[PDB]
């Protein structure tokens, strides 16, 4: 064969901006591009095919044009992000995403129940992501194709497919990448020996609390240790957010219809467990991936409860 036989392909980091390439079919993609992927699959050690003509390949950002695009799209500089995203995508593109009670869920696979619950929660709270990658993928998940959204969640949370996940920790990562700058929380803490003390929390900190599942109990007061050695009380002074997340180590808890938005239930230990999702609508639905049951009341090992909010100020006279 005289001269090199070639094909035209496009490389990308964000799957929107394309970069024309002529590739030599006698060499692998890795020899010509560095690590290369085709819709999640690692083709780095593969030589081009005629069927590859015109297709888009993900590559790592090795030149300043790809770097600017990658960061603008993903808001990250982690050198392994894009590989980790493609590894996850190769699995999540195979998962199933059924509509359960009007929401996009995920049929159980690969220990993914924490992702199912996280995805179902997102569709019930008001949240705008900042990274365009997350906006595009979330919009597409809402409509049914969550494969890219779930791979991105995995990649942002630095969990690989199959690894144990926490819903609260995942929610925390996603909240970091969301506009919550309009959120504010004022707390006060009362100690018999030490006195009063107010604290103001902003952004993410201000919509997550660890220690009680009850927003009522949070408004009324909760007991905590003080530097002196005694128990002090912490109560909510003011709240400004479209939702609040209350979390605590899993514990038997009664979910009362119409008193909360949705919740996470965790059964197991630190080694091994399973998440179910409970949403309060016309009744209480339990969504367990593809599975759906209902009940008028619920008692279970609850670990996260989501409530909604706009503005709240305490009637407690300090
Ligand atoms: C995608 C992107 C955009 C802008 C800057 C950087 N960061 C770089 S290229 N910094 C040093 C190399 N380390 C990553 C190992 C990465
Ligand atoms: C250290 C700590 C403190 C408070 C809450 C949790 N979260 C838990 S125990 N969640 C259960 C699901 N994970 C085990 C995968 C962990
Ligand atoms: Cl968004
Ligand atoms: Zn004290």
Numbering used by the authors: -1 to 316
What's the paper's own text on this?
SARS-CoV-2 papain-like protease (PLPro) plays a key role in both viral replication and host immune suppression and is highly conserved across the coronavirus family, making it an ideal drug target. The main protease and papain-like protease (PLPro) are responsible for the cleavage of nonstructural proteins 4–16 and 1–3, respectively. PLPro cleaves the C terminus of ISG-15 (RLRGG) with sub-μM affinity allowing for the virus to delay the immune response, resulting in increased levels of infectivity for SARS-CoV-2 compared to other members of the coronavirus family. Although we were not able to obtain crystal structures with the NMR protein construct, the full-length protein (residues 1–314) containing two cysteine to serine mutations (C111S and C270S) did produce suitable crystals for X-ray diffraction with structures for 3 different protein-fragment complexes being solved.
The X-ray structures confirmed our NMR studies, showing class A fragments bound at the S4 subsite adjacent to the BL2 loop region, while class B compounds bound at a previously undocumented binding site in the finger region. Fragment 5 binds in a different orientation to most other PLPro inhibitors, foregoing interaction with Y268 and instead sitting in a small hydrophobic pocket traditionally occupied by the V70 side chain of the ubiquitin-like domain. Additionally, the amine group of 5 forms a hydrogen bond to the side chain of D164, a key binding interaction maintained by GRL-0617 and its analogues. To determine the binding site of the two fragment classes, GRL-0617, a PLpro competitive inhibitor, was tested against PLPro and was found to give a chemical shift pattern indicative of the class A fragments, suggesting that they are binding to the active site. All class A fragments displayed some degree of inhibition of PLPro at 1 mM with the most active fragment 8 showing 62% inhibition.
